[PDB]
Design an enzyme around this catalytic site. Structure first.
Site, PDB file in Angstrom:
ATOM      1  N   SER A 233      -0.948  18.080  41.798  1.00  0.00           N
ATOM      2  CA  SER A 233      -0.889  16.862  42.622  1.00  0.00           C
ATOM      3  C   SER A 233      -1.592  16.255  43.148  1.00  0.00           C
ATOM      4  CB  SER A 233       0.083  17.897  43.629  1.00  0.00           C
ATOM      5  OG  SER A 233       1.214  18.091  43.851  1.00  0.00           O
ATOM      6  N   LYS A 234      -2.130  15.062  44.132  1.00  0.00           N
ATOM      7  CA  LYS A 234      -2.571  14.305  43.664  1.00  0.00           C
ATOM      8  C   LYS A 234      -4.016  15.032  44.747  1.00  0.00           C
ATOM      9  CE  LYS A 234      -4.289   9.806  46.204  1.00  0.00           C
ATOM     10  NZ  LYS A 234      -5.189  10.317  46.465  1.00  0.00           N
ATOM     11  N   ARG A 235      -4.026  15.624  45.578  1.00  0.00           N
ATOM     12  CA  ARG A 235      -4.830  16.438  45.703  1.00  0.00           C
ATOM     13  C   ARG A 235      -5.517  17.709  45.233  1.00  0.00           C
ATOM     14  NH1 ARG A 235      -3.388  21.232  48.254  1.00  0.00           N
ATOM     15  NH2 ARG A 235      -1.570  22.645  47.518  1.00  0.00           N
ATOM     16  N   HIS A 236      -5.146  18.099  44.299  1.00  0.00           N
ATOM     17  CA  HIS A 236      -5.624  19.076  42.577  1.00  0.00           C
ATOM     18  C   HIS A 236      -6.202  17.782  42.431  1.00  0.00           C
ATOM     19  CE1 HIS A 236      -2.254  20.740  42.783  1.00  0.00           C
ATOM     20  NE2 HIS A 236      -3.146  21.965  43.998  1.00  0.00           N
ATOM     21  N   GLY A 237      -6.390  16.649  42.591  1.00  0.00           N
ATOM     22  CA  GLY A 237      -7.248  15.701  40.941  1.00  0.00           C
ATOM     23  C   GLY A 237      -6.347  14.883  40.744  1.00  0.00           C
TER      24      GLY A 237
END
Ligand code: GSU
Length: 463
Positions: A233-237
């Protein structure tokens, strides 16, 4: 006849997980000589848009995953947008009701949550008065099972599932009903999709059975995960294909990486989908989730950038730049190739390549802050640059030996330390403190450029 499909819901950009799912379908179809179908699952009116559909088609194209049938090129099993097939779902849901495998549910009008009654006879009078009406599938007792290509034998107890809606009151199908009707009518032989759909499968198999249809072969591909093992997800990159494309990851490299994930490939880890296409085997795919490693992706990309032909790299570079909105100025082709050959040893993405190539491609390059403050401002900067300009100007042979001697003489004769001489000249001709070999850089830039830039730097210093 082998027929597979990628069925994205256009509610956003093409996620790399989706690209990997599309890749395996595409490879299976090309190797088996089958067809790759693109179906747009846009029944979620609020979240789907033509903009997202278009962005997805563009990303698939860029990933080299061309389709044989779809919303843009058509085909014999369309329409290829589920939003354009509402009458087909209606007709088939009706077949189930007529066969007593589904039924209508009539709801109160003032309080839509209140169920009034069920019936196999279409409730015309309630419909005309505005009552919500849905269709539910009648679950038969028994067992539902299938052998998934990667997840193995799966079994399901029908009794644990209550009758469920297949047609909503707004006239739209539920996702599971639309998927089965479309996989059947588009004659899909193999359904290769993400594992997040594994649990939807028993329900789909029940619908195939209610119609007396043979279900296709299923394979649920484990998801691409972040380091904490949750779906990437976005939080991973970064997660969208468009993002990696913009950062300068080559298509062939991204696809190499997506195929490489979880695959203890025999041979070189650096490869193209094209060369692996003939020996493609769905069972080579890992039955466990895979963790996306951004660092490894960049490493893979670097390998491709240095392995491909210089002119292949040049085309990749030119197109990327144009796509990014900062196309390369017009320059000599030999010079372009030479500077590329030198600059690519040091970078791993087309964007990093663009940054170091800029001073080579343009005369208006900027001077880094640290260059100006740490070196150009020193007291000896002026005489070093003036002397460098004088000696370079007198050079009759522009080779690396003479270039190296020119720099050596500046520090040995006491104008400044070796470090200051090297950095003053480097920044003067590139504006940067970190570059490819300094002698190689000066040699390829040429005498005239070198003199012009030393002069330019001197005028800049005078402020
Ligand atoms: N993190 C991840 N890693 C790896 N694969 C992932 C993924 N996230 C989604 N996927 C897979 O990518 C495909 C597209 O996802 S999607 O656009 O949301 N659309 C759908 O899920 C459904 N419209 C597909 C229905 C079907 O195929 O039967 C779907 O096959 C989906 O399962």
């Amino acid at each position: 006849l082998v027929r597979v499909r990628f069925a994205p819901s256009p509610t956003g950009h093409l996620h790399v997980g989706g690209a990997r799912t599309a890749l395996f379908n595409w490879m299976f179809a090309r190797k088996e000589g089958g067809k790759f179908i693109l179906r747009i699952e846009d029944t979620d009116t609020e979240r789907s848009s033509r903009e997202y559909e278009q962005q997805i088609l563009e990303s698939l194209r860029w990933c080299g995953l061309d389709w044989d049938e779809g919303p843009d090129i058509g085909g014999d099993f369309g329409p290829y947008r589920q939003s354009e097939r509402l009458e087909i779902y209606r007709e088939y849901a009706e077949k189930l009701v007529e066969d007593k495998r589904a039924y209508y549910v009539v709801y109160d009008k003032e309080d839509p949550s209140k169920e009034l009654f069920t019936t196999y006879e279409y409730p015309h009078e309630y419909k005309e008065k505005g009552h919500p009406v849905t269709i539910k599938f009648k679950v038969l007792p028994g067992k539902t099972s299938f052998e998934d290509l990667l997840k193995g034998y799966m079994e399901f107890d029908n009794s644990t599932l209550e009758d469920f809606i297949i047609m909503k009151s707004n006239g739209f199908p539920t996702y599971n009903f639309a998927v089965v009707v479309d996989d059947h009518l588009m004659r899909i032989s193999h359904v290769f999709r993400g594992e997040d759909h594994l649990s939807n499968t028993p329900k789909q198999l029940m619908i195939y059975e209610a119609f007396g249809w043979e279900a296709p072969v299923f394979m649920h591909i484990p998801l691409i995960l972040g380091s904490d093992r949750t779906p990437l997800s976005k939080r991973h990159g970064a997660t969208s294909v468009e993002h990696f494309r913009r950062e300068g990851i080559l298509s062939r490299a991204l696809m190499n990486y997506l195929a490489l994930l979880g695959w203890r490939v025999e041979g070189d880890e650096i490869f193209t989908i094209e060369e692996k296409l003939q020996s493609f085997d769905p069972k080579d795919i890992s039955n466990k989730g895979v963790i996306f490693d951004y660092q490894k992706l960049e490493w893979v990309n670097g390998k491709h950038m240095r392995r491909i032909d210089l002119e292949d790299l040049k085309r990749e570079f030119i197109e990327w730049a144009k796509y990014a909105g900062k196309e390369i100025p017009s320059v000599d082709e030999r010079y372009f190739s030479e500077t590329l050959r030198i600059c690519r040893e040091k970078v791993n993405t087309l964007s990093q390549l663009y940054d170091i190539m800029y001073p080579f491609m343009n005369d208006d390059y900027e001077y880094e802050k640290d260059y100006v403050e740490k070196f150009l401002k020193r007291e000896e900067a002026e005489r070093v640059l003036e002397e460098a300009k004088k000696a370079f100007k007198d050079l009759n042979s522009w080779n690396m030996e003479e270039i190296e001697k020119t720099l050596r003489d500046l520090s040995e004769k006491g104008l400044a330390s070796k470090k200051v001489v090297f950095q003053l000249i480097r920044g003067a001709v590139t504006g940067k403190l970190v570059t490819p070999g300094l002698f190689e850089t000066i040699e390829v830039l040429g005498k005239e450029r070198t003199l012009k830039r030393l002069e330019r730097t001197l005028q800049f210093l005078k402020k």
